[PDB]
């Protein structure tokens, strides 16, 4: 009927990340996409604000190093946890999807980490 001694799901763990990640993309992603994806390429920024030279200064600041990391990393966790479940909802069987999606998240997190310790 219903398992008497059912196993504790590991799900709290990913869902926690995805909570932190989701809140971040909610609050901060729109302005970021706006700056990076719209202003930067359309040169719709005043002077030399988004010049190669200026970015690097921020990128390479400690604050930037953390900010860029989280800007990249948190949305992946929220993002991919969502896609993990979208397979199920769409009824798509992916082998070790838990391994696939969270694995991908971990690969990227580490890469990003590497980037913000610099290459």
């Amino acid at each position: 009927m219903i398992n008497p001694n059912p196993k504790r799901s590991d799900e709290p763990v990913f869902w926690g990340l995805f909570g932190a990640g989701g809140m971040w993309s909610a609050i901060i992603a729109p302005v970021m996409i706006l700056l990076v994806g719209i202003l930067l390429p359309l040169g719709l920024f005043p002077g030399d604000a988004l010049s190669y030279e200026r970015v690097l200064a921020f990128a390479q600041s400690f604050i930037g190093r953390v900010f860029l990391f989280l800007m990249i990393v948190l949305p992946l966790w929220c993002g991919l946890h969502r896609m993990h479940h979208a397979m199920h909802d769409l009824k798509i069987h992916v082998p070790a999807g838990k391994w696939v999606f969270y694995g991908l998240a971990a690969i990227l997190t580490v890469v990003t980490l590497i980037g913000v310790v610099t290459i």
Binding site: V31, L40, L50, I72, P75, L76, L108, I119
Partner: protein, 130 residues
């Protein structure tokens, strides 16, 4: 030998197309994709930025591609969509009693939006005013 022959209706993968309410949920969950895609683009940036002005500029030339622009508009639209639903969903996770009543989410939604507004502004100030 029962005479019962329980008929079990099938649940297909087109199930969510039916109800408009299901469609929207799928859509809300769709925001995940461009979200992940923007994180991808950011990684290229972190690294073209790493590999010097040569690469960084070939990056900016990429964003400057008219299709990458359209993807990115959509991408930010998705983000607003996510933001919009996140703030409606998130509050149901709290149980706060004010004056003997369980508060609704509306106060919270307002705050998440206010803080989003400020943040959006402060970043734009910081990013652009120097």
């Amino acid at each position: 030998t029962t005479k019962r022959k329980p008929y079990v209706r099938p649940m297909t993968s087109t199930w969510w197309k039916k109800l408009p309410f299901y469609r929207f949920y799928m859509l809300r969950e769709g925001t995940a994709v461009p979200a992940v895609w923007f994180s991808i683009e950011l990684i290229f940036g972190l690294f073209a930025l790493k590999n010097g002005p040569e690469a960084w500029a070939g990056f900016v030339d990429f964003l400057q591609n008219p299709v990458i622009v359209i993807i990115n508009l959509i991408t930010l639209a998705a983000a607003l969509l996510h933001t919009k639903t996140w703030f409606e969903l998130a509050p149901k996770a709290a149980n706060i009693i004010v004056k003997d009543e369980k508060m609704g989410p509306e106060p919270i939604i307002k705050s998440l939006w206010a803080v989003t507004v400020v943040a959006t502004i402060v970043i734009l100030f910081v990013a652009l005013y120097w």
